[PDB]
Every structure is written in structure tokens, then in C-alpha cells.
């Protein structure tokens, strides 16, 4: 019972840490949007 | 009776869209268009104002 409670603590932080990486890689993208559209707008600008 | 447009030379093509070489870093085809300059960069006030390198492309 005592290896099972440890292993499965273990496994509970292992599967946390886990699931915080897989979050952060699932949930940057928002600046570089940003950045194309100011570029775009610009070069609108000053082609116009 | 036209200004012939300038499809045929490149030169032509050119003048015509830089309008007689007015126009600096714009070309247009469009007569209605508005002239505007490139925006201030936003680093200007950030990193200064640097001179900006003609594409060797």
C-alpha cells in the first residue's frame, strides 16, 4: 500500500507537469500577427 | 491623344507608376490613389532612426 500511495504521488506530479507542458504548447502567435499586420499597413502607406 | 499607357517599356512602365520619378519607394498604377510615406517605425524612438538599406533584391 505504501508503494502504491508513493508511485501514484509520483505519478500525479509526473502526469501534472505533463499536462502544464502540454497546456503551455497548446494554449507568441498574438505579436507576430500584430507585427504582420503593422507591416502590411505600412507598406499599404507608403505604396499608396 | 492619350498618354499612351506605359505597358511596353520598362522605363516607361517606371516613370508611370514613380510618376515621372516622383514617386521614391511606391509604384502605382492606380490614379486615385492617395499618397501616403511609410509610417514611422516604432523602434525609432527605441533604437533611432537608422538608415534603411535598399533590398539587393
Redesign the interface.
Known amino acids: 500500500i505504501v508503494n502504491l500511495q508513493v508511485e501514484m504521488i509520483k505519478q500525479f506530479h509526473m502526469q501534472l507537469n505533463e499536462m502544464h507542458s502540454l497546456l503551455e504548447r497548446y494554449s507568441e502567435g498574438l505579436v507576430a500577427e500584430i507585427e504582420r499586420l503593422?507591416e502590411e499597413?505600412?507598406?499599404?502607406?507608403?505604396?499608396? | 491623344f492619350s498618354f499612351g499607357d506605359p505597358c511596353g517599356d520598362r522605363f516607361e512602365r517606371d516613370t508611370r507608376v514613380s510618376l515621372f520619378g516622383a514617386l521614391v519607394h511606391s509604384r502605382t498604377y492606380d490614379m486615385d490613389v492617395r499618397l501616403g510615406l511609410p509610417p514611422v517605425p516604432d523602434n525609432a524612438d527605441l533604437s533611432g532612426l537608422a538608415i534603411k538599406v535598399p533590398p539587393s533584391v
Open positions: 503593422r499597413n505600412k507598406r499599404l502607406r507608403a505604396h499608396f
